[PDB]
Amino acid sequence: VKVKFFWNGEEKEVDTSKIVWVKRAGKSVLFIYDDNGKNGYGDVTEKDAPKELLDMLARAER
Amino acid sequence: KVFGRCELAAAMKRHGLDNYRGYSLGNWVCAAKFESNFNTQATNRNTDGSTDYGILQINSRWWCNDGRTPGSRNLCNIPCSALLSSDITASVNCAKKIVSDNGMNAWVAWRNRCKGTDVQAWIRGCRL
């Protein structure tokens, strides 16, 4: 599944299979992904988040 | 300050990183090696406009304020310059927040160079 989000004004898409770290911040979900062997960053609102990403956050939150 | 390997190990142990969130001391040492080469003053711009700071290369988007990163959350409530000190306290405390919501997967150097390896090798020979 893709996570569609804007980052530096510009439209990004990241596969959830590349996400390695997830955190809730208010009404947003922060995530780090493997970007061809470097860290990439993003965020999306919890209401816009694909359920696959919400699943990752739920697993992290125990 | 450029720490020696065992010098850093001892400092990280005193700061409570050994087994912090289940990560044994060598994980932290190994991550510092590959993030910063043990140099507290290391800084590196990310292509997205953020910058990474200090011995653990902590990023300015979420953790610290550098004054020039859009959308800064400053979750560690510190200037990024605090992460460059010879005293590792600010970096350790910020690292603990990063891992307390998860793990060391936040660090590219840890994923790429440390995970799955004999990380206790990084603390062998050290007086701890």
Domain boundaries, chain B: 1-128
Alpha-carbon gap, residue B25 to B12, rounded angstroms: 7
Look up residue A33 and give its two tokens: 């992904």
Instruction: Identify the experimental approach.
Output: X-ray
HEC string of A11-45 equals EEEEEHHHEEEEEEECCEEEEEEEECCEEEEEEEE
Q: Which fold has domain B1-128?
A: Lysozyme (1.10.530)
**Domain A1-62 sits in CATH 2.170.190.11:** no
Helices (H), B53-103: 89-99
Contacts of A58 (CB under 8 A, 6+ apart): none
* CA distance linking residue A12 with residue A32, whole number of Å: 13
Residue at B84: amino acid letter = L
Q: Do residues B63 and B93 touch, judged by C-beta distance below 8 A?
A: no
A32 at interface of B, judged by CB pairs closer than 8 A: yes
The tokens of A21 are what? 């770290």
Residue B101 in marked binding region: yes
Question: Resolution for this model in angstroms, one decimal place?
Answer: 1.5
Sign of the alpha-carbon torsion through A22, A24, A25, A29: positive
Instruction: Tokens for B118, please give them.
Output: 């004999």
**φ, ψ for residue B106, nearest 5 deg:** -60, -30
Amino acid (one-letter) located at B31: A
Q: Is B35 an active-site residue?
A: yes
